[model samples]
Structures are given as structure tokens and as C-alpha cells.
Target chain A: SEFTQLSQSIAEFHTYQLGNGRCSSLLAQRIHAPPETVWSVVRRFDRPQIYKHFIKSCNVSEDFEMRVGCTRDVNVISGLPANTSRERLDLLDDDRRVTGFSITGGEHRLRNYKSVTTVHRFERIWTVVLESYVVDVPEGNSEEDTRLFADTVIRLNLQKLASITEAMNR
Target chain B: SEFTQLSQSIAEFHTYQLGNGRCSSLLAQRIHAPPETVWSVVRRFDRPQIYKHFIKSCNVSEDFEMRVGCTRDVNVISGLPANTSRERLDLLDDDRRVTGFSITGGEHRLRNYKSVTTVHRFEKEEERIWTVVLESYVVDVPEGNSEEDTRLFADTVIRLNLQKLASITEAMNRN
Candidate 1:
């Protein structure tokens, strides 16, 4: 019933490359429900567990939420640090876009890169794009290594989101 | 003095573009100062007013600092809402790069886009290829009269940033 509402309202969903080694994608489907119904499902920022089928072992911090300045911890696929934090700062409800900041924690030596993701929604479709960069490193650090690491991590995340959302609709 | 710090310290900065119809671009320059000096100058987010000579007119809101979770309202050349914000979430003092998020705001009808600019410093021995990446986005909105209007607006904004940043940086060096 709730999904029927979502199916009626969504119009289109697609993803594109945002350049700078990032991917921007969208998913639009008509939901026979009101915009708010769809928004409720999309705005569950703290519930990474709901999408666990897609993200695998994500550990969202308790503080995660829809409001600005909220943050969550994400530990994907049993990685070393097992804990990374992402903070939400921008939300345009009328426009249906939510954005946040993220960082890795613990014994991960691959530091100096930062990431931001923004999700935008229309009546029926939604899109999310993430961009990342390495800002600093030791005098002798390798640029190639940094770029490869960032590219790999982001691609995996995008694939995870796409798989989960598709299954939910099915 | 700020520029000097950025030259000495290695600083890296990253930005993001959201949505499907969005596009992004970036620019980088090598200064004589250290990376820390360059970052000190970069961190002065509210000081764009000093670049008025090159930018024509710059209006930056004070809601955010140079740290994480900072948001600002940026207007340039009058009547333009370059609504820009940044979040500094990842930092590596050893390498001088800071990762974050950035978005531009205005009345975008069919296309919604954001640009993230990341600046990274190289070791003194490897300074020849210091990198500054500018990522741009141009998302296509669904069909509507607003779609055409939005595309035109996004194009204009992109051009303006490119033009102004070049001119502004040249002016800074001149002074």
C-alpha cells in the first residue's frame, strides 16, 4: 500500500557520472501516493539497517536523522576501521534534496580525502550523487594510490544503493 | 602571511555535485608560499569581499566558518544566488588536504547541479604537478518550460565562476 503510493508519485530515476571520479544517479518511479508518503520512506536517514540488504554491514550511529547537523557512522563490508562518521548539514525539503559530510575513523591510513553526498527527489523519482577528493598527504605520498582508493570505494557504494532500491520495489 | 602558511603546509580540499542533471568544474594554482599559507587564505571564507575588484560584487553570508558543517549564501555580480555551502569533515594534517561538500543554489527548473573544488599540495620535491581539480555537474530536469530556463541559468553560473576565479586570483597576485 505504501509502495503503491510511491509508485504513483515517482516519474523518473537515473544515474550519471559527475566527473572527478564520482557517480551521480537517480531512481524515479510513479507512486500512487502523496509526496509526503514517498518523502517519509526516503528521509529515513538513520535507518541504514533497513537497507542492509543493499549496504551489507553498515553501522549507522544513533545520532543520524533527517534534520540538518545530524550524522551517522557507516562501516561497510567489515572494513578495518569498521566505523566512519557522516554528518548531515543541508536539507531542502521543498526541493526534496538532502546532503551530508563523511569521514573515515580508526586505523585506516588512507586519510586526506573527504566526501559529500546529496539526494534530490521529485514527485516520483529520486537521485543521489557523491563527490570526493584527497586534499593532503605526506610529501612522498602517491597520487595514483589515493585516486584509486577513492574510486573503488565510491563505485561499491553506488552499486550497493542501486541493488537495494531495486529489490525493495520488486 | 596566510598565503605563506598554505605554501608551507600541504592542504587538500574536496567538493561534490548531487543529482542527475548536474555538472561541475575546478581550478588550481601553485603559489610561492607554503600549503599552510595557501590554506590560511583559503580558510578566510568570508573575505571574498576583498576580491570585489575582480568579481564585480560578492555577497557571502556569515552562517559558516571554514570548518565542518558550514553553510553560506554567495551572490556575485548582483541578482545572482550562487547559494554556496561547504562542510569540512575529513582532514589530514600530515598531507595538507581537507575533504568536504559544496552546493550552489538558485531557481533551477529542469536541471539541478553542484560543483566541488578540491585543491591539493605536493611535496616540495614534487611541486611541479600540484593538483587542483574542479568538478562540475549539469543535471537535466524533466520536461517543462522551467527546464529551458534552468539550463540557461546553470550555464551562466558556471561561466561566471570560471571567469571570476581567474580574474580574482590574478588580482590577488598583483597585490
Candidate 2:
């Protein structure tokens, strides 16, 4: 069955590296609106600022706000130096389920790399999963570290999205 | 605690529109390679045929191979039709992500639309995430029918990606 295969694949593919650690998590849900409605809100990467209420302390540059080739400047709640920048690069946008992206430009302290996050939908609900890793550093770096960071970013971003969706319903 | 706040936000935010659904089914994982190494493999949207072993049914146009504005024809094993076209409209080399696409063609049974996918990274953790969204309307139909077709197309597309990821993982293991 497709459902069974999906479940098995998810369980098997769930394992990922985290700096000196390993983290794995899975989520599935159904949205009341049709999948396209959810997708419109999800795929509008450029307008993330509209949902800024859910995000903690992130801002997009007015020059590049959400469009491809545009860059987004992100800062942790604790505040990183001003020089830091994370550019948003869109790689693929087929009319189907998946979209890919990468980030470029920023302080060396911020590390240098690119990543891709994709969304999948099932019926009225959509399922989104993101996997990313550093490319500028050594190849043999700890997978554990990579996994932890990836896990954290996805969890946080999803939380932001979820908050925005909740508000829309209310 | 940040974790607690994040978790709470996720819970409150996840309305789970379809019945009583779980609030937070979100998960993340990392890799050892630098973000660019990952991006290289990811940014090659033009060369999906090279990675065909992982994808289901892939057709790459000779003219568009490995270049910006390239298009790839794709089909999966699921019940969906085998006719879908994706074009790379924009590329940001500095950032290593494709920013635009056009659905030049696809099965009439399925809705027609275009979309964009992008990737972002956090260098400190050597990690990145790819975000993609497809937006389109059903052609050759009344406005009311457009909404339902759009919903069906989005859901099927998402499922296809899940399957594609699984196939990619399998290929990665063999290599």
C-alpha cells in the first residue's frame, strides 16, 4: 500500500546527523482547507514577513523581500552581529509538491552553506520536511552536529508557520 | 526555555484543519557535509536525469540539460498521471538555489500551474532547509472548478515528493 510504504520509508529515512548527536522526529496532520489553500500559504516564501508575528526576531530585506534572488537577514533572539546575512535562493518550483532552496552570503561566524526544504501534501492536509547541512566546512565534520541544527531550524520554522495558520482560523 | 516556547507555539499554531489531527508532526535531521556540498546536489535542478536512479520516471530535455531555464519531464509510480513538466526560470548562484519555475505542460487530467522552490542554511550548525510551493489554477474550466482541481493537484504533488525522497535515500545508500 502507498500509505504503508510511506510510513516505512519515513521511519527508515528519519535518522539524521546532529553535531555529536542524533535526532529523529515525524509529524502528520490534516488541514481543513484543500491542500492548495495550505500550499499557497506555505509556498509564499517571499512573504514570510506577513507571518512575522509567529516568528521571533527575523526580518527580510526590503530590496529582496521573498522573491527569488532576494536575501533574508535572520538573527537569533539573543542577537548576532549586524554583519550576518542569510540569502534565500530558490532552486525549483514545479507546479507539483516539491520546492527547493539555498542560503548564501553572511559572516564567516555564521558559517557558509546552502540547504533545501520541501513540502508534501496528503489530501486536505500538507506535510513539509526540511533537510540541510553545511557545505563550506570539512566533509568529515560530525553528522551529529549537522542533524541537531537541521532539526532545530525545521522545528522552529514549522512552529512559526503553525502559529500564523492558527491566527488565520481565529 | 526556547524549546518549551517553540513547542507551545507549534501547538497553538497548528490548527490541524482536517478533523482532530496532531499538532506538531514536524521533524528535522542533519548531515555531516557542508551546506554547499548539499547544495551542489540540490542546486542541480537542471540535471535531475543524472539522479534518475532515485527518481521514479524522469525525462530531461536535451536543450535544457544543466542550464538555467531548463525543463524536466517527470512521472511517479503512484496513481497520478505520467505527464508533468517543470522549468527552471531563475537561478541564484551566489545563494545556490532555484527561485522560479513554469509548468510548460502536463496532463489535462491534472491542474496546470507554476511554482518556485528555495533553500536556506544556518552555517553555525552546517545545516539548511529547502522550501517549495506550487501555485496554479485549473485551466479550461469555470472558476468554481478551479479551486477543487488546485487542491487535488497540490495534495498529489506533495505525496510524490515524499516518494521521491524515499527513492533518493535508497540511491544514496547504494552509492
Candidate 3:
């Protein structure tokens, strides 16, 4: 099959998005790599920045231990509302390879802000990583506004992860 | 018997709540008054303060009117985060005896905020009023914050407002 399989995989990649509205949304991707290998980069606090082209810098709190109850004081630049933010690791479980964070500092204008990123084995070599989050819609605003923005943020980082992991194979 | 029909009416009052959740809640009650009587109080943009005991004042926009596309610029007192909130009347249907508003300014912190109040007759012949208010909002919840506090802010105010409407009409009918 000249290019059928590659084209088919590309088609499948874009269709994995599930859920809806600004209140809730899910963007998922099947990365062509082992789960452990994919998670190795994901589990790191700073690794994603290599691919998170939007982040000018991300500084974890000095108290960063990368475990449950640890907090990361993140600083984001390039069009973010707040410069400094505190994100506590609300849920961190390695056996299932899932990690979630709740934003603190109350400066970002995001209310009830919570996000979870989870990884799972799709098969022998394919790994699935999904990100989901919820936040209050600000006055004069709608959920789709925030959700579409969230979707854009999730997909770009995911695309970067996929490209880098696939390149490692070469 | 004089008490025979009253039992049937009491059974109808509790069935009006239509939806659920802290981000969104609906509170409704059946008042022993007519819909026209209830609508009179609800239609006035200024009277909620009498029922909204918590509010020092609910100032409407200079151009405010009770109609679709009208806006109310309200200055809140007491414990609200911001002082001045602008709400736009998004829906006003006379036949439906319904009106709804959406928050538009930074004064109210609730995101994606919209509220609807509807008035209906419990029964055509019964001359009793049924009213419902639904407020939908979203706010971020960090660990220690109580979602209860948010729910209460809307719920307690709505409950008192409804009770006031009922008491107002009841007093008028007696006199």
C-alpha cells in the first residue's frame, strides 16, 4: 500500500477528539511509541517546554519533588493573563501513569481550574495520551471560547510530542 | 369539605423544580396568589431589594427597561467581589411571562452567567401563581474553596426573593 497506511493513521489521529462545550473537552492522540517511553518525557516538569513553543519559561516551585502534594509555581509568558501561577499536583498516580493539577494563586482569572493528563498503552508500540480540563467561563464570555483555546494548546503540544517520539525511532 | 381542594394544591407546589447543579440551579415555588399578581412584583426592576434583603440596592442602567435587549447596570453592596455589575436582559416574552438576563461586566465573577425567571399559573381556575428562577454559572474551584458558598449565594438570595414576592401578594389580597 503505497501511502494508504500513513494516510489512514493521519486520518485517525485527527478524529480522536471527544467531548464538547467550553465546560468540558477532550483531545486525545495515539503516539507511535511505548507508553513508558512517552511517559518518561511527559512525567518531567520541564520536558514539555522543549515542545511547548508558547511557553517563554516554566519554573517549578523550589519545593518540586514531582510527587503527590508537590506544588509547581509556574510562570508563563507570551499572552498569558498572569505571569506567576501555583499549580498543585492534585492527583499523581504512576501505576496508571496519570497526573492532574489544580491551579492556585487566584490570579489567572480561571475559576475552578483543574486539568488532568493521562497516558495509556494503545497496543505494543502505540501510546495514547489525553488531556482534559474545566474552568468557569468569564463574564461576557462563552465556554467555546475557552475550549477552543484549550484545544489549540493541547493539540500543539501533542503534535510536538508525537513528532519528537517518532523521530527517536529514526 | 373546605379542606378537600387545599390538599391537592399543596401537592402541586413541590413539583416545580426543573434542573440541578451548583453551576446551575433552579428554584421554584407555588404562591397562593394569581400569576398577574406575581408578575407585577417580578416585572419591577427595583422591587427585588425588598425581597433581596441582602442587597442594599440593585441599580439599573439609565436606559434600562423591562424588555428584550435592555441592560441593567447594578451596583452591589455587601460581600460581592465587585461593586458594579452590568446585566443584559436577553429574553423577554410576554406570553411566556418569562424574562432572562446574562451578566455582561466584570463586576460579577461568575463566568458564562445566565439567569431565567418564569411565572405561570398553577391551574387556570385555581388562581395560584407558580414561579421559577434558574441561575447558571461557572467558577473555578481550587481545593479549599467551598462550592457550597457559591450555591448558597444564588440559592439563599433566590429563596428569599421568592418568599418576599409571595408575602407581598398575600398581604395585598388580605387588605
On lDDT, the candidate that comes out on top is: 3
Candidate 3's residue-wise lDDT over A47-159, tens digit each? 34765534435776555577777766555432213356567777766776777777776434455667777777664478777777766666565554465555655776787
Off by over 4 Å in 2: A1-33, A49-67, A92-94, A107-110, A124-141, B1-175
TM-score of every prediction relative to native = 0.30, 0.35, 0.41
lDDT by residue (tens digit), candidate 2, A1-170:
53554454454343344432222344333344344544566666555544322122356655644445655565422111233346575654546433444456653422445544444554435444333334333344444344343444355455555555645555
**Native contacts kept (model 2):** 0.00
- Model 1 chain A scores worst on lDDT over the 10 consecutive residues at A8-17
Each prediction's DockQ against the real complex: 0.01, 0.01, 0.01
- Pitting candidate 1 against candidate 3, the one with the higher lDDT is 3
Sort all candidates by TM-score, best to worst. 3, 2, 1
RMSD of 3: 21.3
Q: Which one wins on TM-score?
A: 3
Chain B TM-score, structure 1? 0.44
Q: Write the per-residue lDDT of candidate 2 for residues B79-102, one digit (tens) a residue.
A: 211234444444445453334344
Q: What C-alpha lDDT does candidate 1 achieve relative to the native structure? A: 0.39
